[PDB]
Amino acid sequence: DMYIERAGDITWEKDAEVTGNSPRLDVALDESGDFSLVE
Amino acid sequence: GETTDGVYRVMTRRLLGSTQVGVGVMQEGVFHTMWHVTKGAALRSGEGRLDPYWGDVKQDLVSYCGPWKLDAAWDGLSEVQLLAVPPGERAKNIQTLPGIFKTKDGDIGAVALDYPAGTSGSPILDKCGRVIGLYGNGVVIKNGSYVSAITQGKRE
Numbered sequence: 001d002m003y004i005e006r007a008g009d010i011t012w013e014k015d016a017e018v019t020g021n022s023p024r025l026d027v028a029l030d031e032s033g034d035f036s037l038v039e
Numbered sequence: 040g041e042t043t044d045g046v047y048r049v050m051t052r053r054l055l056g057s058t059q060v061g062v063g064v065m066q067e068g069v070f071h072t073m074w075h076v077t078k079g080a081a082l083r084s085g086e087g088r089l090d091p092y093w094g095d096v097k098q099d100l101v102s103y104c105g106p107w108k109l110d111a112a113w114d115g116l117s118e119v120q121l122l123a124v125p126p127g128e129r130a131k132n133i134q135t136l137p138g139i140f141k142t143k144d145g146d147i148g149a150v151a152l153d154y155p156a157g158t159s160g161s162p163i164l165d166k167c168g169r170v171i172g173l174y175g176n177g178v179v180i181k182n183g184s185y186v187s188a189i190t191q192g193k194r195e
């Protein structure tokens with residue numbers, strides 16, 4: 001039996017840790033909602 | 040139960056201790072997470088009960104108490120923030136310019152940030168604070184690192 005607990009407001013915070021890249025990926029989506037890479 | 044707007048952890052006690060299985064967004068009296076977090080199970084908010092209202096295994100989305108309410112979309116240009124809520128750890132904004140999932144059916148935003156499975160359902164935001172989608176359905180790339188879709192539902 002699952003329960004929810006609050007964790008924060010939903011707000012944009014100026015000067016947050018900027019990171020990660022922007023990869024363009026060819027992908028497929030099966031009927032079970034699994035993304036896969038098409039190569 | 041607590042129906043105040045914002046981000047919530049999704050906990051279970053079925054396993055050892057209390058385990059974070061994912062995250063969701065409360066907005067307009069509706070709770071929004073990804074299907075693989077709850078598998079469509081009812082949820083508890085204090086003594087209140089949240090019942091599933093809509094769900095799709097292929098979108099990997101589910102809503103509680105009402106229809107999907109989040110309809111903002113990535114503009115295709117601007118940086119976003121992932122409001123990561125990791126297990127045992129305080130909520131943390133991470134700013135990023137998303138990549139792209141290219142599929143036969145069109146283009147989806149993708150955020151290249153690796154976090155634990157239990158972070159699934161953390162919201163991804165735009166500069167106006169609107170939720171443009173949820174983190175935690177994606178793919179492990181050539182490198183071995185995780186990339187998530189920006190998964191957004193339809194508001195009817």
Ligand SMILES: Cc1cc(CO)c2cccc(NC(=O)[C@H]3CC[C@@H](N)CC3)c2n1
Pocket residue numbers: 032033034035075099153154155156157158159175176177178179185
């Ligand atoms: C291997 C791995 C790793 C991480 C972190 O490194 C993950 C972080 C969040 C979510 C994951 N799961 C998914 O993206 C989905 C795959 C199929 C879908 N139908 C339901 C879940 C993660 N999977």
